[PDB]
Amino acid sequence: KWKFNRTAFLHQRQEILQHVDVIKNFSLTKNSVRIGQLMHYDYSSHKYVFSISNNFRSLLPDVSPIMNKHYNICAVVGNSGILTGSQCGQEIDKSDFVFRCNFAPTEAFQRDVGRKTNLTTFNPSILEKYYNNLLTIQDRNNFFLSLKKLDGAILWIPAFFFHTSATVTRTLVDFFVEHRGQLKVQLAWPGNIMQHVNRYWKNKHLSPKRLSTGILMYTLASAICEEIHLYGFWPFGFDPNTREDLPYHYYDKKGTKFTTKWQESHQLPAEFQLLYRMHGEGLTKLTLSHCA
Amino acid sequence: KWKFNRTAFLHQRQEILQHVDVIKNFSLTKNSVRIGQLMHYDYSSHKYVFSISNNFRSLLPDVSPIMNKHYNICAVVGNSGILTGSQCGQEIDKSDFVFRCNFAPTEAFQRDVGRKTNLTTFNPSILEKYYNNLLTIQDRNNFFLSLKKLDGAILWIPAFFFHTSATVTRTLVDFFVEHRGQLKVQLAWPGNIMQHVNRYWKNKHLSPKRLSTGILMYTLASAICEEIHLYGFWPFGFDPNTREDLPYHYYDKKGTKFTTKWQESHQLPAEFQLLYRMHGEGLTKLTLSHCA
Numbered sequence: 001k002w003k004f005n006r007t008a009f010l011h012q013r014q015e016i017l018q019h020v021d022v023i024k025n026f027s028l029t030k031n032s033v034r035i036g037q038l039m040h041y042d043y044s045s046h047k048y049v050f051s052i053s054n055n056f057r058s059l060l061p062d063v064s065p066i067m068n069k070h071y072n073i074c075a076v077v078g079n080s081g082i083l084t085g086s087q088c089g090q091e092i093d094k095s096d097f098v099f100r101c102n103f104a105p106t107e108a109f110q111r112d113v114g115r116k117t118n119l120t121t122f123n124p125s126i127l128e129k130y131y132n133n134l135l136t137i138q139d140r141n142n143f144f145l146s147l148k149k150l151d152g153a154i155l156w157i158p159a160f161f162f163h164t165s166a167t168v169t170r171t172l173v174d175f176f177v178e179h180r181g182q183l184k185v186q187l188a189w190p191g192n193i194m195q196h197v198n199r200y201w202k203n204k205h206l207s208p209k210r211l212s213t214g215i216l217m218y219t220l221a222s223a224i225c226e227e228i229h230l231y232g233f234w235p236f237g238f239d240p241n242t243r244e245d246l247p248y249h250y251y252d253k254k255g256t257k258f259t260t261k262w263q264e265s266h267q268l269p270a271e272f273q274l275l276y277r278m279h280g281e282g283l284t285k286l287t288l289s290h291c292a
Numbered sequence: 293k294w295k296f297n298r299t300a301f302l303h304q305r306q307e308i309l310q311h312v313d314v315i316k317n318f319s320l321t322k323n324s325v326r327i328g329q330l331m332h333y334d335y336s337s338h339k340y341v342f343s344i345s346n347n348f349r350s351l352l353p354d355v356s357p358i359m360n361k362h363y364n365i366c367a368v369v370g371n372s373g374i375l376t377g378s379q380c381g382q383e384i385d386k387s388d389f390v391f392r393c394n395f396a397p398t399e400a401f402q403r404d405v406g407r408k409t410n411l412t413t414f415n416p417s418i419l420e421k422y423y424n425n426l427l428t429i430q431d432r433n434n435f436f437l438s439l440k441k442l443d444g445a446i447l448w449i450p451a452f453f454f455h456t457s458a459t460v461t462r463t464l465v466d467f468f469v470e471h472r473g474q475l476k477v478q479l480a481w482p483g484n485i486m487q488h489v490n491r492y493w494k495n496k497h498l499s500p501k502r503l504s505t506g507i508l509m510y511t512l513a514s515a516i517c518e519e520i521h522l523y524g525f526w527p528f529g530f531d532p533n534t535r536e537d538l539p540y541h542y543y544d545k546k547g548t549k550f551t552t553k554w555q556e557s558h559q560l561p562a563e564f565q566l567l568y569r570m571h572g573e574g575l576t577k578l579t580l581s582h583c584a
């Protein structure tokens with residue numbers, strides 16, 4: 001049914017590149033920050049600051065981790081409940097490169113979402129919510145194991161979007177410095193990039209207070225992928241094909257009720273409408289049904 | 293009326309020294325920890341750990357700051373509301389060396405508590421209560437100025453008593469590293485010393501889960517002071533003479549003062565009884581009334 005239009009996608013890549021230097025915005029590098037430099041937060045009041053320490057700078061890459069990288073078929077996997085029972089795991093894992101959002105689980109869900117991960121995003125407040133601020137030996141060990149499972153994947157850590165990241169970023173930084181060289185995980189640390197990313201999408205008549213992680217991933221992916229297939233983008237409470245109730249997230253327990261006010265800060269429906277148009281124009285393949 | 297018994301005090305000093313190496317226990321030093329060493333907490337479950345970083349080690353003194361120090365008259369100033377209207381400021385400031393507790397304010401209270409400070413203690417959670425975790429420029433500036441007012445005094449920071457210190461300690465460390473050489477404050481960082489300090493006081497029929505900061509100060513002071521005068525030790529909500537309501541702290545008097553189970557922390561009444569016996573034996577002078 002769906003047919004890729006390579007030319008139109010590459011024109012979209014060029015248009016994104018005119019508004020966002022993706023290669024650079026992908027991560028701060030050692031030489032782009034000074035020790036003692038005060039960072040601000042893209043989505044918090046300007047009064048919030050974070051001072052760049054020696055240790056933080058030592059975790060930055062020397063060069064963009066996506067410089068001169070090229071992947072043919074990319075999967076960007078959002079977190080919609082539409083993936084549950086899709087059996088898309090195998091097809092996602094055939095991709096050259098898979099992006100995942102917010103350290104999403106794969107273990108109990110591989111048949112549907114895959115086990116391949118080449119990048120996953122990581123808001124530092126994950127440490128507070130799921131790893132008890134790395135306070136105990138067992139917390140530390142659980143986090144270490146989760147990192148080890150990523151192998152050489154990129155962990156894309158946006159520490160300068162929300163001021164609530166500030167204290168937990170120091171804990172994260174200390175852990176990584178303490179374990180330097182023990183893990184193959186490639187760290188990436190984007191800076192204040194949402195002002196640049198928002199410019200491309202304002203032109204496409206999309207102006208939320210906040211763009212979603214999913215669409216941020218598409219934006220990055222545009223620069224390094226030749227063809228992008230989207231999974232788990234479907235911000236609605238029902239299945240499009242069956243009409244049955246659907247959870248918001250694929251990892252939600254069965255029967256969990258789609259939450260209306262979960263997504264009041266986002267404009268996922270407007271994002272989705274725009275991706276859906278893009279699907280129709282052959283720019284990207286939006287998957288909304290079970291895979292083969 | 294009160295008369296110092298030098299002989300009995302010297303016998304107390306010698307006894308304390310046989311159970312606690314005060315000079316060593318006063319502070320961890322650079323060479324007494326390794327980078328990557330896991331610290332445990334004296335008053336928390338053993339599962340809680342804190343990994344010693346490069347930066348933390350860099351804030352440790354090379355040698356115990358009290359090594360070979362000897363002061364004649366020391367004042368140890370607890371934080372009781374009994375100091376309010378005592379006019380003990382001048383008498384406290386005549387001491388050769390003054391110890392204060394938990395970074396207690398002196399500016400608005402000098403007539404009663406003095407302006408002299410040679411050491412003050414600092415639970416790191418002070419940053420969370422009074423300096424908003426150093427999240428803004430104004431918070432950072434306030435904390436800096438409070439530090440600058442200490443001049444070359446010792447800031448005695450027990451980061452390894454309560455696991456709840458862990459995350460704020462990283463904030464504190466980052467601030468001090470960031471501002472290295474800008475302040476004259478001498479940092480001291482005691483480690484796991486409460487097991488040793490408790491041994492002397494167990495023999496004196498005092499066995500709380502936790503000895504108070506005030507009595508810990510007495511213990512330290514015994515090694516470096518010829519004579520110790522106590523002020524602001526009075527763990528009761530009432531004036532000793534009138535029985536009228538008294539604030540728990542001299543600085544936290546007027547205002548909608550949240551009243552909780554602050555008493556359940558410490559066995560302060562038993563400490564106070566013991567200090568009161570000691571006063572009677574001429575070991576130390578416990579002041580419970582106006583100075584002028």
Ligand SMILES: *[C@@H]1O[C@H](CO)[C@@H](O[C@@H]2O[C@H](CO)[C@@H](O[C@@H]3O[C@H](CO)[C@@H](O)[C@H](O)[C@@H]3O)[C@H](O)[C@H]2NC(C)=O)[C@H](O)[C@H]1NC(C)=O
Pocket residue numbers: 019020021022024025026027028190191192193196
């Ligand atoms: C994210 O990417 C944006 C661009 O999409 C980065 O901003 C751009 O940074 C470049 C430097 O790499 C600026 O180039 C400069 O052009 C000016 C003319 O205005 C010239 O005077 C300079 O010599 C330099 O060549 C460019 O102005 C700037 N664009 C915008 C819109 O600000 C931004 O730094 C990236 N941020 C991160 C954190 O990677």
Ligand SMILES: *[C@@H]1O[C@H](CO[C@@H]2O[C@@H](C)[C@@H](O)[C@@H](O)[C@@H]2O)[C@@H](O[C@@H]2O[C@H](CO)[C@@H](O)[C@H](O)[C@H]2NC(C)=O)[C@H](O)[C@H]1NC(C)=O
Pocket residue numbers: 072073227
């Ligand atoms: C990069 O991928 C293109 C597209 O591949 C097809 O679509 C993918 C999503 C996936 O389903 C692939 O298995 C498909 O082949 C490749 O172009 C195709 O090459 C094949 C095999 O050599 C050829 O027979 C097809 O007709 C081509 N299809 C299209 C639509 O052009 C391309 O070769 C890939 N390049 C590299 C170096 O990996």
Ligand SMILES: CC(=O)Nc1cccc([C@@H](OP(=O)(O)OC[C@H]2O[C@@H](n3ccc(N)nc3=O)[C@H](O)[C@@H]2O)P(=O)(O)O)c1
Pocket residue numbers: 077078079080081101102211212213214215232233234235236247248249262263264266268
């Ligand atoms: C309370 C709260 O966390 N809200 C909230 C609301 C919407 C999205 C998100 C985060 O995204 P996640 O739910 O982890 O989902 C990953 C991505 O998947 C997409 N998504 C998710 C669920 C869904 N039913 N349909 C979708 O399209 C969307 O593009 C989203 O960014 P964010 O974006 O980091 O902020 C968080």
Ligand SMILES: CC(=O)Nc1cccc([C@@H](OP(=O)(O)OC[C@H]2O[C@@H](n3ccc(N)nc3=O)[C@H](O)[C@@H]2O)P(=O)(O)O)c1
Pocket residue numbers: 369370371372373393394503504505506507524525526527528539540541553554555557558560564
């Ligand atoms: C929830 C909480 O913090 N509780 C709590 C309860 C009692 C004391 C303290 C702390 O002491 P502060 O109140 O800062 O006072 C400093 C010292 O002064 C003494 N003190 C204080 C008030 C008072 N009314 N009588 C006293 O004898 C006591 O020896 C105490 O250790 P800590 O001890 O760091 O733990 C804290």
Ligand SMILES: *[C@@H]1O[C@H](CO)[C@@H](O[C@@H]2O[C@H](CO)[C@@H](O)[C@H](O)[C@H]2NC(C)=O)[C@H](O)[C@H]1NC(C)=O
Pocket residue numbers: 005007008
């Ligand atoms: C791929 O997409 C491009 C761009 O949207 C298509 O090229 C356009 O074709 C229409 C035909 O109505 C013309 O009006 C435009 O002027 C063309 N624009 C450009 C920039 O070329 C192209 O037809 C699409 N390809 C397929 C195979 O459907």
Ligand SMILES: *[C@@H]1O[C@H](CO)[C@@H](O[C@@H]2O[C@H](CO)[C@@H](O)[C@H](O)[C@H]2NC(C)=O)[C@H](O)[C@H]1NC(C)=O
Pocket residue numbers: 096097098115116117118151153
């Ligand atoms: C993308 O990530 C996956 C891991 O999820 C990488 O695939 C693994 O590659 C190693 C080393 O060759 C194999 O031994 C594993 O069996 C592969 N795992 C899976 C799940 O397929 C893959 O190489 C990465 N791709 C990149 C960086 O292009």
Ligand SMILES: *[C@@H]1O[C@H](CO)[C@@H](O[C@@H]2O[C@H](CO)[C@@H](O)[C@H](O)[C@H]2NC(C)=O)[C@H](O)[C@H]1NC(C)=O
Pocket residue numbers: 311312313314316317318319320482483484485488
């Ligand atoms: C506090 O002082 C005590 C001595 O009063 C030290 O305890 C000694 O520690 C060593 C090894 O670290 C043991 O082999 C000795 O047997 C210990 N003596 C006693 C009486 O237990 C203690 O190390 C000091 N701690 C700190 C952090 O300074």
Ligand SMILES: *[C@@H]1O[C@H](CO)[C@@H](O[C@@H]2O[C@H](CO)[C@@H](O)[C@H](O)[C@H]2NC(C)=O)[C@H](O)[C@H]1NC(C)=O
Pocket residue numbers: 363388389390407408409410443445
């Ligand atoms: C104890 O601390 C006080 C400061 O609180 C020291 O006294 C200051 O000494 C300086 C420099 O000699 C004078 O200019 C100040 O006027 C003094 N201030 C006050 C308030 O007295 C004192 O020297 C310290 N004592 C010891 C023994 O270290």
Ligand SMILES: *[C@@H]1O[C@H](CO)[C@@H](O)[C@H](O)[C@H]1NC(C)=O
Pocket residue numbers: 297299300574
């Ligand atoms: C000093 O204290 C000792 C020890 O308890 C005692 O023998 C001596 O009489 C005391 N001196 C006085 C009260 O002057």
Ligand SMILES: *[C@@H]1O[C@H](CO)[C@@H](O)[C@H](O)[C@H]1NC(C)=O
Pocket residue numbers: 364365
């Ligand atoms: C200790 O202080 C007292 C009280 O002022 C004083 O008389 C005595 O000489 C002092 N001892 C010294 C300085 O050695």
